[PDB]
Amino acid sequence: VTPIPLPKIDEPEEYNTNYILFWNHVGLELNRVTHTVGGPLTGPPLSARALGMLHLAIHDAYFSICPPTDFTTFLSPDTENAAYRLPSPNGANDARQAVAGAALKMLSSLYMKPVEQPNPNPGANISDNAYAQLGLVLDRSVLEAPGGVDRESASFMFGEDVADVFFALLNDPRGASQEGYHPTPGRYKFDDEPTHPVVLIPVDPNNPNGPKMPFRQYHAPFYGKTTKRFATQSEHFLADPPGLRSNADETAEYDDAVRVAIAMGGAQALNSTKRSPWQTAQGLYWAYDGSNLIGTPPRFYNQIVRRIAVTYKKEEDLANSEVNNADFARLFALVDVACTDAGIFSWKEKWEFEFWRPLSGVRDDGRPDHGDPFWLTLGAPATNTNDIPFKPPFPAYPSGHATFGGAVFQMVRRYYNGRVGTWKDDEPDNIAIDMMISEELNGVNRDLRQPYDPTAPIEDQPGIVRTRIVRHFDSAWELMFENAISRIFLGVHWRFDAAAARDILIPTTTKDVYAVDNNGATVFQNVEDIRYTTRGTREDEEGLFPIGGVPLGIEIADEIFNNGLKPTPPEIQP
Numbered sequence: 001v002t003p004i005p006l007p008k009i010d011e012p013e014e015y016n017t018n019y020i021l022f023w024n025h026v027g028l029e030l031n032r033v034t035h036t037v038g039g040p041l042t043g044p045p046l047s048a049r050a051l052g053m054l055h056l057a058i059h060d061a062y063f064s065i066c067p068p069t070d071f072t073t074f075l076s077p078d079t080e081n082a083a084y085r086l087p088s089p090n091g092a093n094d095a096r097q098a099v100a101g102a103a104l105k106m107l108s109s110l111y112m113k114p115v116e117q118p119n120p121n122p123g124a125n126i127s128d129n130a131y132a133q134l135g136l137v138l139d140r141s142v143l144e145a146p147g148g149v150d151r152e153s154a155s156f157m158f159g160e161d162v163a164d165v166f167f168a169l170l171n172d173p174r175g176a177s178q179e180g181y182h183p184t185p186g187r188y189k190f191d192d193e194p195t196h197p198v199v200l201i202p203v204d205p206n207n208p209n210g211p212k213m214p215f216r217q218y219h220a221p222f223y224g225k226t227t228k229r230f231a232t233q234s235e236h237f238l239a240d241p242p243g244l245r246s247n248a249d250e251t252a253e254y255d256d257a258v259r260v261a262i263a264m265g266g267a268q269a270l271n272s273t274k275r276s277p278w279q280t281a282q283g284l285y286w287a288y289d290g291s292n293l294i295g296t297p298p299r300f301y302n303q304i305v306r307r308i309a310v311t312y313k314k315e316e317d318l319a320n321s322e323v324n325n326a327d328f329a330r331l332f333a334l335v336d337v338a339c340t341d342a343g344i345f346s347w348k349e350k351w352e353f354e355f356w357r358p359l360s361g362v363r364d365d366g367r368p369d370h371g372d373p374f375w376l377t378l379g380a381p382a383t384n385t386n387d388i389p390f391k392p393p394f395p396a397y398p399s400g401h402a403t404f405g406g407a408v409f410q411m412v413r414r415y416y417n418g419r420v421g422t423w424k425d426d427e428p429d430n431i432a433i434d435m436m437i438s439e440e441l442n443g444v445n446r447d448l449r450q451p452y453d454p455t456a457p458i459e460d461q462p463g464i465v466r467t468r469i470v471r472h473f474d475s476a477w478e479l480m481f482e483n484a485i486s487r488i489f490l491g492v493h494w495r496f497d498a499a500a501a502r503d504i505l506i507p508t509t510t511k512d513v514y515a516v517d518n519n520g521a522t523v524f525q526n527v528e529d530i531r532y533t534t535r536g537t538r539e540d541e542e543g544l545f546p547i548g549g550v551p552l553g554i555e556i557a558d559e560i561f562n563n564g565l566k567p568t569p570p571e572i573q574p
């Protein structure tokens with residue numbers, strides 16, 4: 001089978017000499033490959049779940065062999081419930097091999113063609129080529145693993161046993177099913193986006209050349225409400241979005257959000273677009289909208305965390321240092337589990353409210369002086385394809401990017417506080433990173449002029465190459481903020497999808513109306529001054545709740561961290 005030529009990753013080759021980072025890398029490679037071939041575990045929420053499961057398995061295998069002192073394994077060897085019972089080592093003491101067995105078994109269980117009968121519905125739409133391409137990745141990873149892989153060792157066998165428990169417990173086979181779901185048209189309501197109202201896909205994935213059939217995608221409408229949570233200790237809720245329920249009277253906020261959406265998120269050439277060239281770059285930088293050779297946001301978030309992990313490591317040797325191994329195993333488990341639960345709660349709230357995307361909101365507004373029936377957004381980029389930009393197939397409120405980012409970066413901030421600097425947990429840190437390149441703007445990936453060719457390196461395919469932009473950031477607080485506002489620049493999210501407008505924008509004397517500069521561009525608050533303090537009401541619940549994705553992710557990370565990475569009590573699972 002012709003292996004797909006993958007473009008080079010911008011990262012020091014030394015990172016992969018550490019076996020914890022190496023297995024994270026294999027996970028990221030499978031993420032970008034399934035999104036290129038249309039294999040299993042695609043989309044933002046399930047792709048995050050895959051990495052959370054990989055890192056829990058790695059975490060409990062490693063720490064069972066090299067017992068920690070500050071915390072314990074996620075699961076326990078002494079639990080009464082067989083489902084949450086961790087296997088015992090019994091003499092196995094090679095952590096490298098135990099981690100290899102756990103990582104390999106988990107990734108194989110997740111990406112293998114379902115031989116266990118359960119294929120219909122759950123994955124009855126994935127070609128054999130997809131499975132074969134992912135298999136090649138798994139096969140060569142065995143040969144590239146630092147220190148090699150000994151499948152015959154007891155430690156390796158133990159790790160496999162560890163992955164089995166986690167796989168049985170947390171795998172959600174029908175997680176992304178949409179069967180039975182249909183939008184309900186109306187003001188503020190999500191429906192198929194007007195530039196991609198229907199797509200034509202093969203009737204048989206094994207014959208991608210016709211016949212095709214009409215398909216309308218609704219991404220994981222039942223997941224958030226039915227799936228098992230990983231480590232959260234309660235259910236998380238957001239305030240009703242402007243225009244709906246208890247906040248249906250918040251019309252000045254809504255109308256101004258419509259204004260900001262047009263100015264900041266329109267197509268490049270529209271006379272109404274006020275976004276600057278730099279802001280367009282900040283918008284594309286954080287995309288990772290499930291594109292060919294790129295994958296989803298959790299992939300990028302891990303790429304950033306690898307850099308942070310290595311930049312702030314306690315010891316200089318990446319290959320043979322149990323201190324570095326332990327630090328990385330713990331960090332990635334915390335970050336990826338937080339990313340998984342953020343995906344769950346952002347999806348639960350997305351489909352609870354079914355709030356429409358800005359493209360439809362602006363076009364269908366209905367008022368002659370507020371909407372633009374012909375507006376076009378910069379959009380989510382269809383990188384490495386000759387397709388046009390699109391609107392992700394799921395509700396707007398809250399933003400998945402914003403929630404993932406709040407969780408991932410608040411976790412990094414809780415983990416490194418007192419080690420890299422000192423700050424109050426709800427205030428800006430000093431976790432700086434440099435030489436950070438996004439694959440959306442690396443001087444290699446591009447917008448093609450003809451269909452993508454999976455047998456040729458991307459460099460040999462005609463298109464407009466994305467400018468290479470090397471960035472430096474001063475804090476994880478900045479990372480969290482830019483990640484969220486990037487979606488406003490693409491025009492795929494409303495301001496309140498990221499956070500309360502009051503917390504991120506500059507106020508004017510007019511309530512709910514914010515500042516714009518000379519060229520009518522929105523002015524944001526300096527990162528150092530931002531505090532996510534504005535909360536709102538819910539019609540069905542008493543109390544004040546966070547507004548938008550960032551504050552939601554932040555609360556998810558704090559809860560998990562504060563409870564020391566402990567399973568969600570079986571009592572409160574759906």
Ligand code: VO4
Nearest residue numbers: 392399400401487
């Ligand atoms: O991923 V959004 O939900 O920020 O499109």
